Amino acid sequence: TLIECGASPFIPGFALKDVRLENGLTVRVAIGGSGSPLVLLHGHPQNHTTWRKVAPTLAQNHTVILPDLRGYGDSDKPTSDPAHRTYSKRTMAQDIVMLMDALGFSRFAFVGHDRGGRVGHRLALDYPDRVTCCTFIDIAPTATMYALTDKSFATRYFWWFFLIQPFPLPETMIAHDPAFFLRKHISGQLKIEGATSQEAFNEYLRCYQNPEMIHAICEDYRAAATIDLDDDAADTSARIRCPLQLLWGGLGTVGQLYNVVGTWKEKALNVQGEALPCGHSPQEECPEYFIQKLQSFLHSVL
Amino acid sequence: LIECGASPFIPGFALKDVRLENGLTVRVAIGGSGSPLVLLHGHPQNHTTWRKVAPTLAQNHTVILPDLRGYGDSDKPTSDPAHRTYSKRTMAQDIVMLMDALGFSRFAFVGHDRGGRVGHRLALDYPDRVTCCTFIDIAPTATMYALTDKSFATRYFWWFFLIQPFPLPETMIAHDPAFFLRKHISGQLKIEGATSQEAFNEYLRCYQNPEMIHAICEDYRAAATIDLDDDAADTSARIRCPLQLLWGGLGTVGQLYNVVGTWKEKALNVQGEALPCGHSPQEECPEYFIQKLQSFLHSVL
Ligand SMILES: [Ca+2]
Ligand SMILES: [Ca+2]
Numbered sequence: 281t282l283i284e285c286g287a288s289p290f291i292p293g294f295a296l297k298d299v300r301l302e303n304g305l306t307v308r309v310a311i312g313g314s315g316s317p318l319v320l321l322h323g324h325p326q327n328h329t330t331w332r333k334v335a336p337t338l339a340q341n342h343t344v345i346l347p348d349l350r351g352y353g354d355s356d357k358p359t360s361d362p363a364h365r366t367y368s369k370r371t372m373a374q375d376i377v378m379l380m381d382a383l384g385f386s387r388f389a390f391v392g393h394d395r396g397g398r399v400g401h402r403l404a405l406d407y408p409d410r411v412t413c414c415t416f417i418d419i420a421p422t423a424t425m426y427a428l429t430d431k432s433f434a435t436r437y438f439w440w441f442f443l444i445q446p447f448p449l450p451e452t453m454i455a456h457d458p459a460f461f462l463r464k465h466i467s468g469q470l471k472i473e474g475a476t477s478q479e480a481f482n483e484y485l486r487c488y489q490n491p492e493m494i495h496a497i498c499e500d501y502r503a504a505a506t507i508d509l510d511d512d513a514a515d516t517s518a519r520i521r522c523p524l525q526l527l528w529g530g531l532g533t534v535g536q537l538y539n540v541v542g543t544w545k546e547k548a549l550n551v552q553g554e555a556l557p558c559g560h561s562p563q564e565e566c567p568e569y570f571i572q573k574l575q576s577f578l579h580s581v582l
Numbered sequence: 583l584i585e586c587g588a589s590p591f592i593p594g595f596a597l598k599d600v601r602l603e604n605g606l607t608v609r610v611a612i613g614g615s616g617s618p619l620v621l622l623h624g625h626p627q628n629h630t631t632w633r634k635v636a637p638t639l640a641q642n643h644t645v646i647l648p649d650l651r652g653y654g655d656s657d658k659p660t661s662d663p664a665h666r667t668y669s670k671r672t673m674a675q676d677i678v679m680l681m682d683a684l685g686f687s688r689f690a691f692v693g694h695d696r697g698g699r700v701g702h703r704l705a706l707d708y709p710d711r712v713t714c715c716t717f718i719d720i721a722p723t724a725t726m727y728a729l730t731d732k733s734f735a736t737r738y739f740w741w742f743f744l745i746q747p748f749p750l751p752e753t754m755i756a757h758d759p760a761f762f763l764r765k766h767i768s769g770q771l772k773i774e775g776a777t778s779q780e781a782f783n784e785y786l787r788c789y790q791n792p793e794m795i796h797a798i799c800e801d802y803r804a805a806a807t808i809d810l811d812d813d814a815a816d817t818s819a820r821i822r823c824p825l826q827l828l829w830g831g832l833g834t835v836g837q838l839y840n841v842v843g844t845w846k847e848k849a850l851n852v853q854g855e856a857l858p859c860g861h862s863p864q865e866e867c868p869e870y871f872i873q874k875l876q877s878f879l880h881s882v883l
């Protein structure tokens with residue numbers, strides 16, 4: 281089913297909808313434009329408004345679909361399970377093809393940022409015929425990150441060891457001052473004169489202040505250290521079939537620590553990538569440069 | 583020395599503030615008679631962690647229980663940007679200075695947690711002053727950071743949280759000091775109830791001071807930075823005095839390393855065993871801790 285929730289107050293030309301999937305979950309989505317389907321999927325601690333600066337341009341040549349991850353934004357936030365399956369990337373990925381089935385699309389182009397990229401990686405493996413191409417933003421594979429855990433990794437990515445502690449520790453810490461934690465996750469990501477306005481920060485905060493999101497976020501991270509790694513090892517011999525593009529911040533953390541394109545070679549057939557003049561979020565920090573790079577890739581995929 | 587009255591938790595012991603040569607003042611509990619035996623606590627306790635074993639040990643020794651700088655009721659001086667102020671070299675200097683001021687020469691040493699990391703540096707910087715060492719539930723700092731892997735960073739996540747740049751961890755702990763103390767103590771102990779509510783209350787009295795929370799962080803930052811430099815600068819050196827390792831079979835350090843093995847690479851004369859407890863045998867299984875320490879001190883002294 282589709283319920284219409286008015287126009288997007290943040291992204292001109294896009295309509296907000298609540299879509300009920302066959303797995304009984306309801307997701308919040310913003311849709312705009314016309315043409316071949318393009319899904320842009322946000323990460324943590326954002327929601328789909330992270331695409332507000334690029335989405336309208338992209339909508340000129342595509343039907344742009346901006347979902348809120350389960351547990352995030354305004355999508356449902358189901359209570360979880362002890363193995364964290366409910367927030368595994370496999371379940372998240374399944375949410376994405378079921379949404380597409382519900383909007384009537386068959387094959388689609390996919391772009392994913394932060395958590396959204398991890399969902400995408402699993403999406404491209406579980407449903408290789410559905411995805412025409414992939415663009416993963418500012419991430420190296422989940423299994424690779426944890427496998428290379430060293431003093432330096434654990435220091436620079438300390439949340440990857442804090443957000444995974446057993447319930448309710450991280451949930452309790454964050455709840456002490458949600459805005460403070462959000463600032464760390466956002467001002468650490470940018471650090472280049474105001475890529476996130478007070479209005480956009482308030483919108484992300486509005487969502488982040490819901491303890492149900494706080495918990496989903498921790499379950500997502502817990503899954504990434506457990507069930508997601510089980511799933512990723514079970515089919516480690518498999519490779520992403522569609523063309524893959526990596527876009528990452530030359531001044532972000534992952535770009536300063538690893539050869540980004542190099543981390544995706546064993547995981548995919550045809551790969552390519554480049555560093556952008558920003559930190560963690562090129563769609564917010566250097567939108568115009570981001571669009572150009574995404575357009576070239578999308579239009580090159582036959 | 584300035585008398586502060588009888589200890590309210592350790593029968594027969596007196597509390598004192600002692601002013602060292604480096605201008606610092608440390609709180610110390612002293613009881614007993616005989617040769618000096620230093621027992622140095624770690625994080626997030628104070629010298630009261632030794633309340634269960636100290637009076638028994640006081641029968642044959644003059645037992646000295648300092649609060650590390652930055653902890654308990656000792657001074658908590660302003661730190662420096664390199665973290666040298668809370669480095670294990672400096673902390674060790676406080677100890678030898680404390681002994682000079684109490685008039686003692688050579689002494690026996692025991693260190694738990696941060697206290698044992700201090701003793702490591704102590705035996706290396708002042709080999710003549712130490713008759714013997716016992717380190718409790720610790721593998722050397724350099725070995726721990728070097729073997730950093732997923733389960734380690736997960737099990738000992740605070741080694742990556744307390745070292746985040748100022749003022750992040752401090753701000754987070756300040757939101758609810760008692761909550762974060764409780765999680766530490768719960769994660770340390772395996773023998774449930776080894777830290778009574780009264781004992782916990784005494785640790786909380788000190789931990790809720792923001793000056794203590796900052797110093798704790800500085801201490802961990804030292805261990806991730808300047809401490810490792812010192813350890814590399816004399817990597818060929820080895821502890822000469824007899825070394826004993828007592829750790830908890832049921833805890834993290836016990837399950838991740840060959841404890842005795844990690845120390846053989848740092849010392850000439852090494853022994854030790856796992857006790858049926860978590861991180862703090864002096865509180866979780868006092869009788870077996872006393873028995874084990876006494877045989878070592880007797881076989882050596
Ligand atoms: Ca593989
Ligand atoms: Ca005390």
Ligand SMILES: [Ca+2]
Binds near residue numbers: 767768769770771772
């Ligand atoms: Ca416990």
Ligand SMILES: [Cl-]
Binds near residue numbers: 395
């Ligand atoms: Cl991520």
